[PDB]
Amino acid sequence: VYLDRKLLTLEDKELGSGNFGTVKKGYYQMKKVVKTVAVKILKNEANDPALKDELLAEANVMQQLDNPYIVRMIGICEAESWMLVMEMAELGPLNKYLQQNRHVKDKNIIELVHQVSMGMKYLEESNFVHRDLAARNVLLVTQHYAKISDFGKWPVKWYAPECINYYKFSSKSDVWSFGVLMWEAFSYGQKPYRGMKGSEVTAMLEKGERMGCPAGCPREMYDLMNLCWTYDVENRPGFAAVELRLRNYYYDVVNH
Numbered sequence: 696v697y698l699d700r701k702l703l704t705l706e707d708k709e710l711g712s713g714n715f716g717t718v719k720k721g722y723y724q725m726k727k728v729v730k731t732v733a734v735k736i737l738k739n740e741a742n743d744p745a746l747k748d749e750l751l752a753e754a755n756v757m758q759q760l761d762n763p764y765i766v767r768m769i770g771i772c773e774a775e776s777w778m779l780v781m782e783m784a785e786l787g788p789l790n791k792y793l794q795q796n797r798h799v800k801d802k803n804i805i806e807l808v809h810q811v812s813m814g815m816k817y818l819e820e821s822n823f824v825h826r827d828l829a830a831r832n833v834l835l836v837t838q839h840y841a842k843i844s845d846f847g848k849w850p851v852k853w854y855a856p857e858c859i860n861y862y863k864f865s866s867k868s869d870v871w872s873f874g875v876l877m878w879e880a881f882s883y884g885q886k887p888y889r890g891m892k893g894s895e896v897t898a899m900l901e902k903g904e905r906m907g908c909p910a911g912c913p914r915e916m917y918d919l920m921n922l923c924w925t926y927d928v929e930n931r932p933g934f935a936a937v938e939l940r941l942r943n944y945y946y947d948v949v950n951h
């Protein structure tokens with residue numbers, strides 16, 4: 696639950712930078728072995744007791760969410776600053792990985808997005824709405840093991856129309872984001888709606904227009920992105936339906 700700072704070694708290089716924290720790679724001593732971890736060090740400049748409350752609440756939320764397809768919590772550590780200790784996904788975000796590894800097979804991409812649907816089906820079942828599902832928020836443990844993470848101005852290009860218009864956030868608006876995620880993945884981490892303003896994307900979507908099928912993307916997978924992009928929220932699938940369609944496809948295509 697609560698970790699001993701003496702058992703925690705921090706590297707001075709930053710994996711992430713933010714207004715309320717700095718992420719650093721570390722090592723947590725465990726009897727015989729040492730476990731590589733990612734550490735959010737609370738930056739409370741600031742200087743409120745509610746910021747610490749938020750970190751402790753996130754820790755409680757994370758404790759409840761236990762699934763192999765989400766960045767899992769190791770524990771909390773109170774030292775020079777408050778620290779949240781998480782497992783390390785050594786390859787970093789899915790977008791950057793794919794921009795540098797054009798050799799990734801489309802069979803390997805089906806497996807990754809299915810794993811993302813599995814973790815999102817879990818979050819849906821636990822009544823948890825992500826709100827920032829994108830490729831940059833999918834971190835790789837290995838090339839065959841994806842984990843969902845969550846690191847004013849909004850990520851409009853991943854937003855469902857009911858989020859832009861009425862601020863209605865649900866698991867079904869996370870489904871829309873999943874479809875933008877799938878597009879980013881088969882496009883080898885290229886930016887969705889490249890060079891468009893958020894306002895331009897809203898207008899395009901209202902004309903019934905959607906992003907084209909990436910090069911080499913299987914047709915069944917593009918058909919699924921399009922169903923994730925259903926304008927009417929009531930007709931849009933949930934993650935139970937999405938995961939089941941990806942599971943079947945993985946069972947058919949990837950078995951070997």
Ligand SMILES: Cc1ccc(NC(=O)c2cccc(C(F)(F)F)c2)cc1-c1cc2cnc(Nc3ccccc3)nc2n(C)c1=O
Binds near residue numbers: 733780781785834845
């Ligand atoms: C350090 C850290 C603290 C907290 C979180 N939070 C979550 O993952 C989270 C919070 C709420 C909901 C959910 C959801 F349930 F939806 F999943 C997740 C994440 C981190 C954290 C972990 C992490 C793991 N690996 C890497 N790898 C990496 C490698 C190369 C370059 C960049 C990153 N990075 C991580 N980072 C940056 C983290 O912040």
